[PDB]
Amino acid sequence: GILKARQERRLAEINREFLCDQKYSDEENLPEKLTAFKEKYMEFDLNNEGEIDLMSLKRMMEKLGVPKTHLEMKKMISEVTGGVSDTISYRDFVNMMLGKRSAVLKLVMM
Numbered sequence: 670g671i672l673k674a675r676q677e678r679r680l681a682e683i684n685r686e687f688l689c690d691q692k693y694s695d696e697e698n699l700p701e702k703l704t705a706f707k708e709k710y711m712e713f714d715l716n717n718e719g720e721i722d723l724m725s726l727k728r729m730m731e732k733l734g735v736p737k738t739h740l741e742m743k744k745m746i747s748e749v750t751g752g753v754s755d756t757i758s759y760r761d762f763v764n765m766m767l768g769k770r771s772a773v774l775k776l777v778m779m
């Protein structure tokens with residue numbers, strides 16, 4: 670409970686940083702999209718760092734009824750992180766959701 674409430678205020682701080690980021694100065698409905706992405710990201714069982722790891726993905730694909738193998742999950746993450754981290758951070762998740770590049774995880778969400 671306390672873990673999740675402090676998780677979301679950490680995500681809220683990040684959203685507030687995006688609301689002021691000149692990169693997204695274009696985006697229409699930005700406050701709304703960011704709220705929705707925070708709620709979606711909060712649906713994962715995040716790791717000790719508050720990030721989506723192999724475990725978080727596994728649990729999510731299973732809740733959603735979508736079969737993924739070890740390697741497919743590995744690839745779903747490196748695809749979204751461009752291969753520089755083995756976990757998806759909220760920043761990476763938001764940039765994924767806003768970005769025009771397609772991603773298996775982005776397409777799995779919807």
Ligand SMILES: [Zn+2]
Nearest residue numbers: 678681682685
């Ligand atoms: Zn604050």
